[PDB]
Design a protein around this ligand. Sequence first.
Ligand SMILES: NCCCCCC(=O)N[C@H]1Cc2ccccc2[C@@H]1Cc1ccc2c(c1C(=O)O)OCO2
Ligand SMILES: NCCCCCC(=O)N[C@H]1Cc2ccccc2[C@@H]1Cc1ccc2c(c1C(=O)O)OCO2
Lengths: 150, 149
Amino acid sequence: SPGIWQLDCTHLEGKVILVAVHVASGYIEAEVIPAETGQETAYFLLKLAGRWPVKTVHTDNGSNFTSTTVKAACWWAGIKQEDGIPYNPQSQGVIESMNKELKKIIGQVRDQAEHLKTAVQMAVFIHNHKRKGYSAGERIVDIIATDIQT
Amino acid sequence: SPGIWQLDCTHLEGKVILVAVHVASGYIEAEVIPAETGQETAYFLLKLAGRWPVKTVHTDNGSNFTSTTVKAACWWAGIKQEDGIPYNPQSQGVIESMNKELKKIIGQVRDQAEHLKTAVQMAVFIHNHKRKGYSAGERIVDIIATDIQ
Ligand SMILES: NCCCCCC(=O)N[C@H]1Cc2ccccc2[C@@H]1Cc1ccc2c(c1C(=O)O)OCO2
Ligand SMILES: NCCCCCC(=O)N[C@H]1Cc2ccccc2[C@@H]1Cc1ccc2c(c1C(=O)O)OCO2
């Protein structure tokens, strides 16, 4: 559970926002990309895995599951690549709600930045610091620290 | 100390590698950029601060210290912008050693990637996971968790 992440792809302003959610905490990382390709997804995963201990990634769709570049990145970074089939059906709804929330925050900050990528990073900041009580940022750190003492 | 970061700028293949070091742990984040501008530095800081609890940043030079865009990012993200004057003189050497180490790792992986940015992210991964004994990645998490508790 401490090492499980979920990829998620949402759209805004004719661009793609690629999101990784740390399942146990709700902490996220995100980037704006022109289109969701294997190469973009692979590069995003490499960045993520150098920053947090990524053990398992539930890919967002079958194309990224299949992509040889994504498999190469997962091999390189020691990540177990899994599907994202919501065997637990509440997962689809949680992700959809998260996407709606992110789009809302982006809208609230959009005017403070010239570029969408900047607004998305502002939204990541706000999401991860939001007290809901601990923040997602506090939760991921706690969860991983607890795991290390084991 | 748990919230203190140091910016660092090094060069390779006619490009710029911008690095943030978490001082207490030695954990790093890094990106390749065409040139070190206020705008690049500001954007990098926004990314960093949304991901880790950045309280204080020791800027890498006076231009980024002065940049109004960098100040805007630090204001926005709630970061205290400080200079990077090594009042403690061992700081220059530690950073220089880190840059050398990173360039070495980059060289070791360079052939596995078409693009420099990919090699740099591989080097970040290796640096943060390297057991010295705990890894830098384990140390940053421990330090911040202790601070929360
Ligand atoms: N020079 C001879 C070797 C060239 C082999 C290229 C090759 O398949 N490496 C993989 C191995 C590997 C392993 C993990 C991550 C990336 C990569 C690379 C793929 C890659 C993917 C996405 C990107 C990239 C590159 C890049 O290649 O940089 O750049 C920006 O987004
Ligand atoms: N209604 C439009 C008003 C325009 C205000 C522009 C403005 O100063 N925002 C700051 C506020 C703010 C606060 C923190 C970080 C960035 C920014 C933004 C600066 C910025 C910097 C670097 C970048 C950017 C943009 C960007 O502006 O996206 O893009 C990629 O690298």
